[PDB]
Design an enzyme around this catalytic site. Structure first.
Site, PDB file in Angstrom:
ATOM      1  N   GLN B  11       0.825  -1.202   0.000  1.00 43.15           N
ATOM      2  CA  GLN B  11       0.000   0.000   0.000  1.00 43.15           C
ATOM      3  C   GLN B  11       0.862   1.256   0.000  1.00 43.15           C
ATOM      4  OE1 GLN B  11      -0.008  -2.679   1.763  1.00 43.15           O
ATOM      5  NE2 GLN B  11      -0.321  -2.378   3.965  1.00 43.15           N
ATOM      6  N   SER B 140       7.932  -1.447   1.706  1.00 44.46           N
ATOM      7  CA  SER B 140       8.117  -1.100   3.106  1.00 44.46           C
ATOM      8  C   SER B 140       8.584  -2.334   3.862  1.00 44.46           C
ATOM      9  CB  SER B 140       6.832  -0.541   3.726  1.00 44.46           C
ATOM     10  OG  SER B 140       6.469   0.686   3.118  1.00 44.46           O
ATOM     11  N   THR B 179       3.529   1.231  14.154  1.00 43.49           N
ATOM     12  CA  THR B 179       2.169   0.904  13.745  1.00 43.49           C
ATOM     13  C   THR B 179       1.756  -0.505  14.146  1.00 43.49           C
ATOM     14  OG1 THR B 179       2.892   0.131  11.566  1.00 43.49           O
ATOM     15  CG2 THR B 179       2.384   2.472  11.802  1.00 43.49           C
ATOM     16  N   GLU B 254      26.425   7.720 -12.340  1.00 44.89           N
ATOM     17  CA  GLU B 254      27.446   8.677 -11.928  1.00 44.89           C
ATOM     18  C   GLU B 254      27.531   8.788 -10.414  1.00 44.89           C
ATOM     19  OE1 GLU B 254      29.478  10.158 -14.013  1.00 44.89           O
ATOM     20  OE2 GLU B 254      28.538   9.472 -15.875  1.00 44.89           O
TER      21      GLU B 254
END
Lengths: 432, 439, 65, 29, 107, 65
Positions: B11, B140, B179, B254
């Protein structure tokens, strides 16, 4: 798609299920006729979880009513929404249970079980994929307690990869309804701890006290308690019924708040429980809601959670506030009230906010947690059961059915083991 | 040419991708319909949009991104949006069952079911492109989807393309706020995968975002949208020289070549500046020296860590907007003699000069104001190792009596992997302190 | 003079315990050092012992015949 | 281990004097 | 002298590297000339100087180095100055290691 | 009045101080016994190494035939 099949058992279970169905129908805009009269957006898409698509858009309940006394079907059918359900699901016998678990399980659970298995199998095959099965019942009798355990065992054996959540009604010594009630409780808790995923504790005395001292109701009745539990389950189920930002499902809750399979019991609770005259004088904010979800006064338990330590906490919000206040509140609560939760496991509070507000109320939030408070209930049940099994009274009735008495011995041994486990994990010290 | 493919798992990954795509469409004047209906009053769009978008035969733009999630709810939420006419449904794969902060299921019993589909999709996308440099994997660590599915896909991508750059962007579980509870369970397993199979990894949290927004943006009630906007601005600033030109072009290769001093130490410290609101951009003179000095302030970092505890090995500066070389030279001269900033006795200097002529754009309804120039910082220092130390301590204290481990055992997974990941992180830390130890 | 010495001792105890709390942190890094070698080493030890015994038995009874 | 540790050991060793002074103050109170 | 060599060492602007610091145009909008900076901007390394006075010369001046009133100087015993003297030992070492004792020098 | 207020504040201060003290003392002693367990663990490392030395020489014995 992802649908939920609902089950019914026991007269109290049947009435609370009918109340829940009426509540959700009113919330989602369903007329008593069978058509749709809603005006929302998310009330059409994910509506099929509890309903089934049919012609003319007439959505239909997905619930099977199991009972041993047909006097309940006539009562529940005469209601404002009793003509919408499926009469086929109303499978009733001819002889009553008589508040006997063994007799109902043996006599009235052999020739009637086949029909309910056939209909639930048909319902399961009717959908593509399913998540779990919800059964609402009570332990006060042989209807809710005698058969639900057998049905749960059968569905686990057939479909092991499903969610088994229930809201069985725990007894209370101060307010009883059956003389042999602790016998039935001892028999049922064994199947609860052996062949059941999770179970929520339901007490009538605590709800009565809560309403009396906070809602200040003139003539509180079972309708009030049914509405309360319906709101509780609806707040539980909105995580999947009404998706928001941080959505959750039953199985994640089950895994996250069960540290050990032997301890799967929870305690529910709803935050906004005020009086009639106090509703238009109120401040809708986070700290107040946290106070009402943290105090034992608002909790529906007939015990004191302050006697033990918090194990698992889940905060399920329903509205549009935000994230940060919840985390700061739980942080400071754990900082200050350090002597109320397991120091070994940090961050025992789960965040969950439903962006979709409920119908009729603006801010709503339920409390689902597992605190150390059921140990008193288990030990007093064990005490009363040992006392009753000492001289063996009210036992000839169970003896005459055919079953022996060793079952009581093994059940009480299991109860002793469980309470010992609970008490020695209560003092979960860091080390030596 | 300079074209990349973005990956959005979970999500958080999907919402970040949405924010990035909308930022790109508004910054290039790309209309939500997918064509250029601007036939009366033109407002831009004559540039090199081929890096991210594709030009069809009728003048349509097709986004080049991967939107995969195990839960169909997020895909549905995106579908009902106003940008549904932009992308294509085939790029948004739904699912029956998800992980939802669980690694074992999403890595064995969930993620392994949808493999051929995403591989075929990414192969088609790669064939649709000519020049490929790197990828933009957005996931995540707390999310079980963006951990298990991300790991299982990135291993296959690593073994399928060894000559392409492998980036990483996800969220770090803050030690103070969180959370879920099983977040470090996923993190300990995902860190090993991202370490021994990738080239670089970017680690950020939200509590630092909260601190910076309340301190600077001065919002009593923040939201995820601001966080996503910050992340999108950072990402755009990083890949600024790709969509456009300037005095000194800094491509992905680079910078990533120098940003990795060692195969084990590839966790830079990103810093975006200025992160300010509308009223903070009117009566505040903005030069380069001040913001470069502000970039090294711990209050402005997106990771809670005091830089004064360790020292810096490699530093990368980027710029975007009307910047003058003399200001950059003066800032370098100032910082090189500052006694507060610590560095090793081995690298007297090292950095990059990215001059971007096009200034960053604004968003109607957002919080960022019209700023003449921007700057992004990517440094490498050993003081960040405390976060891994805290993670190891937490994993240890929760692994002593095997809390919530029977679930993973029953799903099917080796227990010794926890010991393996623990010892791998221990060795990684030990290497980090040894590097931090000077002569 | 009594109250003066009382305030002096008050500040003394304040500083004594505000400097005690560093040894709570010091024991924090000490049990962290315990974290370094207590469990992964023990886990690897026991699993190594088990596999060593198993393969010992296997090879020994393979060769004895 | 650092000067914090040696100071902690010294104050633990002198905790007897610390507790003696504490008890003297409590008795005076 | 001591503290004004130490505090610019502590903070920004007053003692940075002036070798590349620009100039300004003024007079009236723009009809004149740029300004100039002509000081230690070059790179001049100015050492530290100190001054005292000897005993008998001081006595003949009027006082054998008498201390002032014991009660006035809360600034000299200000807790801020004492703490900075505790704190800035590194910079005070970096500036000058020659702590002076002078008064005993007369011929 | 001043001594009464100082008494109240110092009593609260020392109540929480004496709340901290036994915790850290028992933490010290249990830490000592944890280091004892560390020593135990290292000893099982040593005996496992002895067993694997037995393994290596017995496997050379089975290799020679």
């Amino acid at each position: 798609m992802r649908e939920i099949v609902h089950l019914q058992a026991g007269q109290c279970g049947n009435q609370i299920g009918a109340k829940f169905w009426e509540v959700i129908s009113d919330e989602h805009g369903i007329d008593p006729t069978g058509t749709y009269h809603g005006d929302s957006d998310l009330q059409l898409e994910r509506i099929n979880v509890y309903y089934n698509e049919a012609t003319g858009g007439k959505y239909v309940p997905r619930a099977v009513l199991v009972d041993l006394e047909p006097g309940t079907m006539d009562s529940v059918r005469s209601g404002p929404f009793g003509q919408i359900f499926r009469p086929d699901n109303f499978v009733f016998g001819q002889s009553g249970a008589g508040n006997n678990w063994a007799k109902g399980h043996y006599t009235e659970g052999a020739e009637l079980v086949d029909s309910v298995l056939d209909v639930v199998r048909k319902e399961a095959e009717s959908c593509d994929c399913l998540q779990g099965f919800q059964l609402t019942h009570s332990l006060g009798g042989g209807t809710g307690s005698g058969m639900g355990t057998l049905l749960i065992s059968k569905i686990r054996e057939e479909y092991p990869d499903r969610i088994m959540n229930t809201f069985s009604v725990v007894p209370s010594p101060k307010v009883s309804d059956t003389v042999v009630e602790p016998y039935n409780a001892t028999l049922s808790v064994h199947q609860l701890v052996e062949n059941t995923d999770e179970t929520y504790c339901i007490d009538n005395e605590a709800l009565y006290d809560i309403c009396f001292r906070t809602l200040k109701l003139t003539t509180p009745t079972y309708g009030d308690l049914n509405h309360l539990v319906s709101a509780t389950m609806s707040g539980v189920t909105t995580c999947l019924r009404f998706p928001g930002q941080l959505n959750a499902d039953l199985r994640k809750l089950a895994v996250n708040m069960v540290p050990f399979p032997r301890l799967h019991f929870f305690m529910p609770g709803f935050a906004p429980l005020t009086s009639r005259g106090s509703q238009q004088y109120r401040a809708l904010t986070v700290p107040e809601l946290t106070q009402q979800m943290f105090d034992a006064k608002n909790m529906m338990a007939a015990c004191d959670p302050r006697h033990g330590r918090y194990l698992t906490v889940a905060a399920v919000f329903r509205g549009r506030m935000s994230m940060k206040e919840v985390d700061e509140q739980m942080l400071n609560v754990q900082n200050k009230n350090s002597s109320y939760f397991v120091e070994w496991i940090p961050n025992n509070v789960k965040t969950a906010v439903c962006d979709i507000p409920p119908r009729g109320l603006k801010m709503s939030a339920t409390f689902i947690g597992n605190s150390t408070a059921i140990q008193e209930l288990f030990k007093r049940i064990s005490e009363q059961f040992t006392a009753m099994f000492r001289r063996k009274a009210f036992l000839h009735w169970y003896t005459g059915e055919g079953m022996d008495e060793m079952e009581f011995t093994e059940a009480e041994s299991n109860m002793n083991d469980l309470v010992s486990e609970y008490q020695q994990y209560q003092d979960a010290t860091a080390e030596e | 040419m300079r074209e990349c493919i973005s990956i959005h798992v979970g999500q958080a990954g999907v919402q970040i991708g949405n924010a990035c795509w909308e930022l790109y469409c508004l910054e290039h004047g790309i209309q939500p319909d997918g064509q250029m209906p601007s036939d009366k009053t033109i407002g831009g769009g004559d540039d090199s949009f081929n890096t991210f978008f594709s030009e069809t035969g009728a003048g349509k733009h097709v986004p080049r991104a991967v939107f995969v999630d195990l839960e169909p709810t997020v895909v549905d939420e995106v579908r009902t949006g106003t940008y549904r006419q932009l992308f294509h449904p085939e790029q948004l794969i739904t699912g029956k069952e998800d992980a939802a902060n669980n690694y074992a299921r999403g890595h064995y019993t969930i993620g392994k079911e949808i493999v051929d589909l995403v591989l075929d999709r990414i192969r088609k996308l790669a064939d649709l492109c000519t020049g490929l440099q790197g990828f933009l994997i957005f996931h995540s660590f707390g999310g079980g989807t963006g951990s298990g599915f991300a790991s299982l896909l990135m291993e296959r991508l690593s073994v399928d393309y060894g000559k392409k750059s492998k980036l990483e962007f996800a969220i770090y579980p803050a030690p103070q706020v969180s959370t879920a509870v099983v977040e470090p369970y996923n993190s300990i397993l995902t860190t090993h995968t991202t370490l021994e199979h990738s080239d670089c990894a970017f680690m950020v949290d939200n509590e630092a975002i909260y601190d910076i927004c309340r301190r600077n943006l001065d919002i009593e009630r923040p939201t995820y949208t601001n966080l996503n906007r910050l992340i999108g601005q950072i990402v755009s600033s990083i890949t600024a020289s790709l969509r456009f030109d300037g005095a000194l072009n800094v491509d992905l290769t680079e910078f990533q070549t120098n940003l990795v001093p060692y195969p084990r130490i590839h966790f830079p410290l990103a810093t975006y500046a200025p992160v300010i609101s509308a009223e903070k951009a009117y009566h505040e003179q903005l030069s380069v020296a001040e913001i470069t000095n502000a970039c090294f302030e711990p209050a402005n970092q997106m990771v809670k860590c005091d830089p004064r505890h360790g020292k810096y090995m490699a530093c990368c500066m980027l710029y975007r907007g009307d910047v003058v070389p003399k200001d950059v030279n003066a800032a370098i001269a100032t910082i090189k003699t500052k006694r507060t900033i610590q560095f090793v006795d081995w690298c007297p200097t090292g950095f990059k000069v990215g001059i971007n002529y096009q200034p960053p754009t604004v968003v109607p309804g957002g919080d960022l104001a019209k700023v003449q120039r921007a700057v992004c910082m990517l440094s490498n220092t050993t003081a960040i190792a405390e976060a891994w130390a805290r993670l190891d301590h937490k994993f240890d204290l929760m692994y002593a009596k095997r809390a919530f481990v029977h679930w993973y055992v029953g799903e099917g997974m080796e227990e010794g992997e926890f010991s393996e990941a623990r010892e791998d992180l221990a060795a990684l830390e030990k290497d980090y302190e040894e590097v931090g130890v000077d002569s | 003079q009594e109250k003066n010495k009382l305030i002096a001792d008050l500040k003394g105890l304040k500083l004594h315990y505000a400097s005690y709390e560093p040894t709570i942190r010091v024991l924090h890094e000490k049990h962290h050092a315990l974290l370094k070698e207590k469990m992964l080493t023990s886990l690897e030890r026991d699993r190594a012992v088990g596999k060593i015994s198993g393969l010992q038995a296997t090879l020994k009874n393979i060769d004895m015949g | 281990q650092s000067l914090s540790f040696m100071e902690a050991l010294a104050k633990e060793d002198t905790d007897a004097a610390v507790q003696s002074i504490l008890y003297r103050e409590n008795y005076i109170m | 002298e001591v503290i004004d060599r130490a505090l610019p060492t502590q903070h920004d602007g007053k003692a940075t590297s002036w070798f590349w610091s620009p100039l300004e145009y003024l007079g009236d909008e723009m009809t004149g000339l740029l300004m100039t900076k002509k000081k230690t901007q070059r790179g001049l390394v100015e050492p530290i100087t100190h001054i005292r006075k000897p005993l008998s010369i001081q006595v003949e001046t009027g006082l054998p180095a008498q201390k002032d009133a014991w009660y006035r100087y809360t600034w000299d015993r200000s807790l801020f100055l004492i703490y900075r003297r505790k704190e800035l030992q590194s910079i005070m070492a970096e500036l000058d290691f020659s702590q002076q004792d002078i008064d005993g020098l007369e011929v």
